[PDB]
Subunit: 295 residues, 6 copies
């Protein structure tokens, strides 16, 4: 026989996961973990299954960073260089995709008939959300805030929502948590959009993104077209970036955003309160996580 | 309430599938679904499950074109621009990853529990294949040709096998067709390597820096001449550099060496087919014509 | 004194007009001065003032080519390189702005006080035209075709009208020719849009990202397909992308739609001409041949 | 009728003037205004006409910045981003040209038979001056200082000279001021050339300009060709820029320049004195403006 | 000891001469060694020393191609890619400088003490030549044509003379051939200038910005037109710009002027040859055929 | 006669040497000079010949910088801009080559039958060393440390070795010094490789060089391929550069290097001691030069 099929080896696996291993060694904020833990105060998933869910969500989150950073044309990730800047675009892209499949083999280990539908519908919402955001970026067409919120619902829903639904599906109780979780994802994103601009310097302007405050500033005076024109230019320069910061303060767009985040956080606390009144323990950890996204 | 979640709309699906629909409408050889039918002479999968397997395999293949064209940095696909030169690399990449997911939602329609293990395990091979090839590319390390075929079995076999393993999961017959069908994916790829240089642009595997089959043979046949491998490093677009490499590769008798190997492999494919038939199987004309349309 | 001011010299004028002289010497259709004579059959402007109007219109037109070729980022002009690819974009732009001023010094020779209001008010239209077109380009916003013609009247009419309004200021006849002459500048532009794609490079309006007439029709005829408008975004130089768009634009029956519109417009131009003649005007052969050399 | 011609609208006008409005909102030095005002101590143009002259000169000056910055390939303008870096080259270029025409419609409002000839000959000198400067830049051919001074006479004459001549032509008195004004423009430019190099860092070297001190340094030792070669390179880098600063001090080119500016300022004060002796008030404001361009 | 020094190996020489071997194997006119033999009819250098002179001259010439192709930024050499587009500019440059040194080690085999003064003094001319040409290029300063020939004598004569001066150092005859042989290197270069434009790419001296002979004549024949010299500034690759310059250079009757000058120079070469022969020298057919193969 | 051959002129010579004159005016470390002087404590070359040797080695060293900086694609040289960044690549390249020939005319002045063979074999080793280093850089193939040391032996041998051999060949005594000198060159290079990374910021990573510590770090864990991938990217950015610094400390590669340099310096001091015991003066200056390359 001319062809003899060899076995996969630790060394080859080390190559394929090089960019994934790279990203997992940078220190980051434990966000996904704390949210899982604070919901487990209520769902009490068994330790063996909760570990599986926690591994799947860790893999999925990192592979998503490998691909987002490429699609968003990013420069830094958790303070260190973005992974395609070390390994090149192709290998980073392929490491992310390999990991999507590996996580599917992991979620098979729950042995739950409904698991794979939950995983599919979550990843469809993810891609759907990132899809609409790229469409607006690529066409210079500023969405409305309702439109943005629906998009981020799928984007920063997809993966929060996947974790909580895998948890719900492995737990005895039947309380529907995902409306709460979607609100928490939307808050988290609007807080991220703000911090990206007030804390590289304003990297969302480099990437051309119609983020939540950028939308308010563009719509609040459509006679002026300076900010939207800047987004088209995708500037690397700190003078243009600084100039747009200044224009966005002058439209009161950061006050507007702090304002919205207050309204949403109230809605979340009511939803949490209305849930404990129906026979769930008081959750401290979730109130704490909700203070952690604060401006 | 402040937030009111909306229903995904047909206009929005149109945007998400912009790149996918565009690639789908360019005409192609469609040699994947001819192979599938050729095998359905033996496994006799009912029509309503075959449509699903065809639909799933076609989706995955268009998806991996969207993505691999970005990865390999191609210029043309089926004589026309790569999707990302029209839609940009980000929307094209997301549309790819989108379709990978709709493919998984679709394979669930078989309602066969072996189906998910088969789908997952074949895509893992596809990535291992693509992964080792990019690795050899980016390190400027020429692999051996056993290493090359190992990689190619995973990569171009990965989704030939997906199609047949799914078919075997809907058939009751207890015969392993997979070794046959991998041998065929190798032949298909080695042909594609040869045809890339002697017949998607002038020699786009040179522009890509891909260590393809004849390039491998020509590099290793004389390692004291590093003209060929240094040309891969420069990823040339110039027709002058490409034509010189092609001429170097001729004087190494590499194109002959390739023609030679695919002939030994086609014989091995025929034997393998005749063995299957001598174990109570119909004589298969269509599979033999598939193997012959795979030639030069 | 330390500073002693010098006299501008013929060698220095040669440098300032380097780009202008270069463009002037490439042969052109010269359809502007044929239109001017065609109208002088009715208005009978004396020879010595007509030479000035011709000189002024020719200058302004070459000036706006120097400048608009930079703006639109063209590659060829009259089959030859754009002036700025030879002299650089700064000297070419200044030579343009220089000539705009010598044109104003020249229109003062008519010694007609209406002349300055006419000159200023037509250049303001030219800029409004060019301004709205660049705006639609740079925002990736497809205008409607009423919006398109409004823009085109200002832009390609702006300097047809300059030529005739100046002529009417030296004639005593009390007949408004301007509506006729704007209708003609529209036809001339819609022809130019069509000829840019079906006949200055292969489809340079695609490379420029210009929302031209048939491109507009093809984009709006099916807004669930964003292939065309995304191709404008990429400003392609590749012949492969340009040829695909051209092929997309065919299947929308846009080239037919254009041929159609210019036919309705040529009829409207003929009627308008015959009306003017039925009010005590000589029958004009030359204007009708101008309208026919404007066709496909 | 197939075609119906619409009217121009506030919105469309807002688009066309976007880059012009942008530049007018950045704070700058009130130079042109103060010079007009200090000459009005002598010419006493009527308020209604002086406002017209002041508007025309403001428009003309800003549109000239829109186009110079493009032609000079500039990065910053009054500390903020250059306008074609926000709006793109074409729209900025076209905004400048539209404004040249609008200002011509404005100078029509003086209703003066001689106004338009003054405006034409001023703008011809402007373009003539910038024309010769680009020619030297583009051909790597260092002019002589006499040649430079004639060029800047037209360049920074054209627009100073336009304002004072429009003023003279609207005033009762007949004293010829433009020889004084040309000297004041030359001083202003030589002072600008110095400050560009001693106060982005040395942007005249990025743009390849043969400025007044750069000329002295290149000619003072033509055996060395380092500085002229640097101009050909058009460097964005601060090491090359720093190196040329150092070479220019070693040829005593900044001392030479301070020297010239002293000689010229004397000539200006004598011209001002010789003018008051013939029956004009003592002008404080012009002596003050002349102290404002000091090194 | 910690450090143990190794012996240079044949595999390592192969890498160092990678670019040199590559250039050597492309076929060339080999007009240098035909000139050498033509002169050996008079000087009768023994075979074993002539082989060394040939070997040394061939090495230096290939070395200076490796290096000057980087300097001038060429695209093709002998119809094929420049070595640095394959090996990179650093290895190609080092291989050049390497061979310069092996050439010096080789000229030591003559064991002639005049040989080192001749070798050093001719390479110093080569650099002075290349140096003044780059200088005129990079300052955009057109030289005069006396300045041009002064430069060319150093540059293209520098290594014609090396070959003959070495030959005269092994012959006993007391006749100065060098003035003849420099005149011939000038003719060879002026031909090469003309053939670069009228016959290594379309007009690669335009793309390089080289002030070659006809370009010089055309620039200076009318200094109030700066189209030609501004085109040199842009170093155009576009065929459209190159073709326009070529057309400008025609209307200056520069190609005629060149044909003219090489005819006066060929006459001067013939006279010079006949004078040498009238001082007791064999009639030389081969040198006259060399001079005729140098023509258009 | 149509052609009249002119003479070379001071002015033309000034042009050709412009980039060479430029480099000689920047202040640098007197390394080559001090090593020559400290060996002359032993060889006592006559003043007239030692000056010739000292001129040849100065020329050769500077012309080598003109060409290395081009081949290594360098940005700074002795703190000031690299010479091809001022004069362009071609003129810098040609200035270096002209100077190689001029130095050959200089070494003719020793009038020594053996001089020119010494010069040839030294410059062959030079090119041979730089040749192998470019080969590894260009092929992403990490050498072994033995292989690196042989390469640097020829590279930083060639020119140290040329000076000492020209000296030996002009001196009465017959003690063979070049084994000592080769060790001193290897030390000097390993010290340079270290300082390039711990003192532009890490320019050896920009240039893709397999320097001594970079080799140890790549080989010490071939499972990880981050550092070698970075070399392929040739980064100008300080985040990637910083990230690789951090990875190299974590493999103890700088400790390893200090370690080696200690071992070699001992070997050198023994060689120096073993030489004085055979009837040579005690050399202070060479012990001092050996303390000057210290980490």
């Amino acid at each position: 026989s001319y062809y003899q099929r060899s076995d996969w080896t630790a060394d080859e696996e080390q190559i394929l996961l090089g960019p994934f291993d790279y990203l997992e060694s940078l220190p980051g904020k434990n966000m996904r973990s704390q949210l899982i833990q604070s919901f487990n105060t209520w769902l009490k998933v068994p330790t063996e299954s909760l570990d599986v869910i926690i591994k799947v969500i860790s893999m999925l989150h990192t592979a998503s960073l490998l691909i987002d950073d490429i699609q968003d044309q990013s420069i830094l990730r958790r303070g260190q260089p973005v992974a395609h800047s070390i390994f090149g675009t192709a290998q980073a892209m392929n490491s992310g995709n390999y990991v999507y499949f590996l996580a599917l083999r992991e979620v098979q280990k729950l042995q739950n008939p409904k698991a794979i539908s939950i995983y599919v519908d979550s990843l469809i919402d993810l891609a759907r959300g990132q899809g609409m955001e790229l469409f607006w970026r690529d066409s210079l067409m500023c969405p409305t805030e309702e439109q943005y919120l629906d998009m981020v619902a799928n984007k920063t829903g997809g993966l929060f929502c996947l974790a909580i639904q895998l948890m719900q599906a492995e737990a005895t109780i039947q309380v529907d948590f995902i409306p709460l979780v979607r609100l928490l994802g939307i808050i988290f994103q609007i807080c991220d959009d703000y911090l990206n601009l007030k804390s590289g310097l304003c990297e969302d302007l480099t990437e051309g993104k119609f983020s939540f405050p950028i939308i308010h500033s563009i719509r609040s005076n459509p006679g002026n077209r300076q900010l939207i024109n800047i987004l088209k230019q995708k500037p690397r320069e700190d003078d243009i970036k600084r100039y747009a910061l200044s224009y966005m303060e002058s439209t009161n767009s950061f006050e507007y955003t702090r304002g919205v985040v207050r309204k949403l956080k109230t809605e979340a606390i009511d939803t949490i309160q209305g849930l404990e009144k129906h026979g769930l323990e008081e959750n401290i950890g979730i109130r704490k996580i909700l203070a952690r996204m604060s401006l």
